[PDB]
């Protein structure tokens, strides 16, 4: 029921789907990287800040 123009159009839409998933997944991954960044940073900061405070 679809012409070659329409088939190619749908192929483009499906590729758009793939690109969209690629972006969403990467964004999720970068967000988690930032979460892990802040979590580990906090852990480290508090641990050594407390050790410094204790020496003071």
């Amino acid at each position: 029921a679809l012409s070659d123009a329409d088939v190619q159009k749908q192929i483009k839409h499906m590729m758009a789907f793939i690109e969209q998933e690629a972006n969403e997944k990467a964004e999720e991954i970068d967000a988690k990287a930032e979460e892990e960044f802040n979590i580990e940073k906090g852990r480290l900061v508090q641990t050594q800040r407390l050790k410094i405070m204790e020496y003071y």
């Binding site: 029921a1 679809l2 329409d6 088939v7 749908q10 192929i11 839409h13 499906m14 789907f17 793939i18 998933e21």
Partner: protein, 750 residues
């Protein structure tokens, strides 16, 4: 314009897996598409629909389990709605679990009931008792007493009782009269002996007696407990039944819902799941003309799916053998099946079924041309159709009835044509139908023609009615003049007709079968198959067998009784034709110059053989070497075709002698069944005749059906069908294909 199979696209569809579940469900309801397995080397565990199928299978078996209880409970389970919508949300799995809970509850209730039943009966026995006045059928009591006398000499009297309207024995499972005769002993050795005997013998022994008022009070407590047990039992059973019927309603819907889900998952297993994306690619066969319908269904399916993936199905360069799809309906389906029984036609082959619808019943009617049986045969088909809704929407475990039912529309026609042919044959249970138009001869003029008081000698003779006396003649308007049905030489006048008719019909039908091959060879653009095939083949058959047909009609209109002496014999001229045998005398010729015509036609038939025999492979070799192909094998194959064609034409023409052979047999079986049975029902004694005719006819009716309506009808059915398969189809209906098996929700009644 001939009927052919539908176009197939061998097309592939890619869409997201979420969309895929919905789409498969919706395309499945469409029932117009058949999916192919893209992973033939992958088992169900590998397909990864196994968890879904396993769950479906468990649900199915458990549902069937409960269904058995439902059916025993006579629940209507009408299955008239909701189920057709087959929704397939993931939440159905929990619904499946809910089903399992219900049937499991039911299983526990019945188990409890049986234990309760035992307790009921056990307490009932005690109730009755209040050694012991127990429950015994007096099976071995006559011997129980003697066994006691055998152990000791009847040291203690026995207690006797009889139970009126005894209770249903629990071990028996049914109610039997109970009678008790049990002995009590004071001695321990002997009491133990009695215990052993009572255990061995069919007796009820476990009473816990007391003589105190307290025991009578206990017996009252027993009655109370019995009543409470029965009350609870009654409530348990009532709940059970209410639950069972209520479930039966939902279960009819569920059955089909579950079946559909299973089919969907199984279909999705027959696919190739991509590895890198949650999207599914599959190749499917589908009708070309229905592709738009498929895309609209896909649009609706994916629209229901939240991802609205385009779900585009794109045609591929179809290059594998497609399935053969013939659209059938309530009428034509049966005829297509008897064709398919022989084989599935080649893709874009000419479908013989549109011609079978008439051709086969017609040939049957020729074999079964009996008006009276045609009525019976027609009425049977009408009955089946009129009850179609009641027979179809039911269970029919007997495949013999189902088979004839499925062919009920085929039989209907056979009846209608059997009436037509029987009337032309002018035979209705061996009786002719005189419409007051029988003017074969004028007997008054017979006596004028030098036949004076012939009825004197007639007492010992027949005397054949002469042709061309100047006062006889004129055809019967429709069918065979009734006069022959009462002649002693029917068996020659009408026998000749049927022989010649069978030849005429067979040869003409064969020529039709050949003519169809031309259209097929044109469709596939095979010039060689018509320039070296069709043309010499149709000429060969025409020159030999069509010539014969012409001569048959010629004789009927060319020669009268005026030339009955030395009247040409068509069979002898036919043989002499082939052999170029032209004696100077002994046989008159049908027409002047026939010798030249007979010689010419045979020469042409022989000259037709080289064309079909070897000219095709020779030109293929020419074109091959000009372009430059197993020449040897091609020559052999083509030679085989010619050999079978020519020899088959000879044998096939004779084969249609089946039409005569069976038509003769039927008339003869009918005549003898009439003459040797119903004739006896007539008598010069009034009352004896009337009463006897009743019983004799009933026997006649019984034999008429048993011998002719069934058996010979079956023979005519098969032989007419065999002619269709062997002589007709083999002239054009060649090759094989695959049966079209689309994914669809067909199994609703099953």
């Amino acid at each position: 314009e001939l009927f052919r199979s539908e176009e197939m696209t061998l097309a592939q569809l890619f869409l997201q897996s979420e969309a895929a579940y919905c789409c498969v469900s919706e395309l499945e309801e469409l029932g117009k598409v058949q999916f192919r397995d893209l992973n033939p080397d992958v088992n169900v565990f590998q397909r990864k629909f196994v968890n879904e199928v396993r769950r479906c299978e468990e649900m199915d078996r458990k549902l069937r389990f409960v269904e058995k209880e439902i059916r025993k409970a006579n629940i209507p389970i009408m299955d008239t709605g909701e189920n057709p919508e087959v929704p397939f949300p993931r939440d159905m799995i929990d619904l499946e679990a809910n089903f399992e809970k219900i049937e499991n509850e039911l299983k526990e209730i019945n188990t409890n009931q049986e234990a309760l039943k035992r307790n009921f009966l056990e307490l009932t026995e005690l109730k009755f008792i209040l050694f012991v006045a127990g429950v015994i059928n007096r099976e071995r009591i006559p011997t129980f007493e003697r066994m006691l006398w055998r152990v000791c000499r009847g040291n203690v009297f026995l207690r006797q009782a009889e139970i009126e309207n005894p209770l249903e024995d629990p071990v028996t499972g049914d109610y039997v009269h109970k009678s008790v005769f049990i002995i009590f002993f004071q001695g321990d050795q002997l009491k133990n002996r009695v215990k052993k005997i009572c255990e061995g013998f069919r007796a009820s022994l476990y009473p816990c007696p007391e003589t105190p008022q307290e025991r009578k009070e206990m017996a009252s407590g027993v009655n109370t407990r019995i009543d409470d047990l029965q009350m609870v039992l009654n409530q348990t059973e009532d709940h059970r039944q209410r639950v069972l019927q209520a479930a039966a309603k939902n279960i009819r819907v569920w059955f089909i819902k579950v079946r559909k889900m299973k089919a969907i998952y199984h279909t999705l297993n027959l696919c190739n799941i991509d590895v890198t994306q949650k999207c599914l690619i599959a190749e499917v066969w589908c009708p070309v003309t229905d592709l738009d319908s498929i895309q609209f269904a896909l649009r609706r399916g994916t629209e229901h799916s939240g991802s609205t993936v385009p779900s585009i199905l794109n045609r591929m360069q179809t290059n594998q053998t497609p399935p053969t799809y013939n659209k059938t309906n309530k009428f034509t389906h049966g005829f297509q099946n008897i064709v398919d029984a022989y084989g599935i036609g080649t893709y874009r082959e000419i479908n013989p079924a549109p011609y079978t619808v008439i051709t086969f019943p017609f040939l049957f009617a020729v074999m079964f041309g009996d008006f009276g049986h045609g009525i019976l045969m027609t009425l049977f088909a009408v009955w089946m159709v009129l009850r179609e809704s009641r027979i179809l929407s039911q269970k029919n475990e007997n495949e013999m009835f189902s088979m004839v039912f499925s062919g009920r529309y085929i039989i209907l026609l056979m009846g209608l044509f059997s009436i037509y042919t029987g009337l032309i044959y002018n035979d209705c249970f061996s009786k002719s139908l005189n419409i007051f138009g029988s003017s074969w001869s004028v007997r008054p003029m017979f006596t004028i023609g030098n036949w004076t008081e012939e009825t004197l000698l007639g007492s010992s003779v027949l005397q054949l009615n002469p042709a061309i006396p100047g006062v006889f003649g004129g055809p019967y308007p429709f069918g065979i003049d009734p006069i022959w049905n009462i002649a002693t030489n029917k068996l020659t006048f009408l026998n000749s007709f049927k022989m010649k008719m069978s030849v005429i019909l067979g040869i003409i039908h064969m020529l039709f079968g050949v003519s169809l091959s031309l259209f097929n060879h044109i469709y596939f653009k095979k010039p060689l198959n018509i320039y070296f095939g069709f043309i010499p083949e149709i000429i060969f058959m025409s020159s030999l067998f069509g010539y014969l047909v012409i001569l048959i009609f010629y004789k009927w209109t060319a020669y009268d009784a005026h030339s009955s002496r030395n009247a040409p014999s068509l069979l002898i001229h036919f043989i002499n034709m082939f052999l170029f045998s032209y004696p100077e005398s002994g046989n008159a010729m049908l027409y002047s110059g026939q010798k030249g015509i007979q010689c010419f036609l045979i020469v042409v038939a022989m000259l037709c053989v080289p064309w079909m025999l070897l000219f095709k492979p020779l030109i293929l070799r020419h074109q091959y070497l000009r372009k430059k192909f197993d020449f040897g094998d091609t020559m052999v194959h083509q030679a085989i075709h010619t050999i079978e064609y020519c020899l088959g034409c000879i044998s096939n023409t004779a084969s249609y002698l089946r039409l005569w052979a069976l038509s003769l047999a039927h008339a003869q079986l009918s005549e003898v069944l009439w003459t040797m049975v119903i004739h006896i029902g007539l008598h010069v004694r009034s009352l004896a005749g009337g009463l006897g005719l009743f019983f004799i006819f009933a026997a006649f009716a019984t034999l008429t059906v048993a011998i002719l309506l069934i058996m010979e009808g079956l023979s005519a059915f098969l032989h007419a069908l065999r002619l269709h398969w062997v002589e007709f189809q083999n002239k054009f209906y060649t090759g094989t294909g695959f049966k079209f098996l689309p994914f669809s929700f067909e199994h609703i009644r099953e």
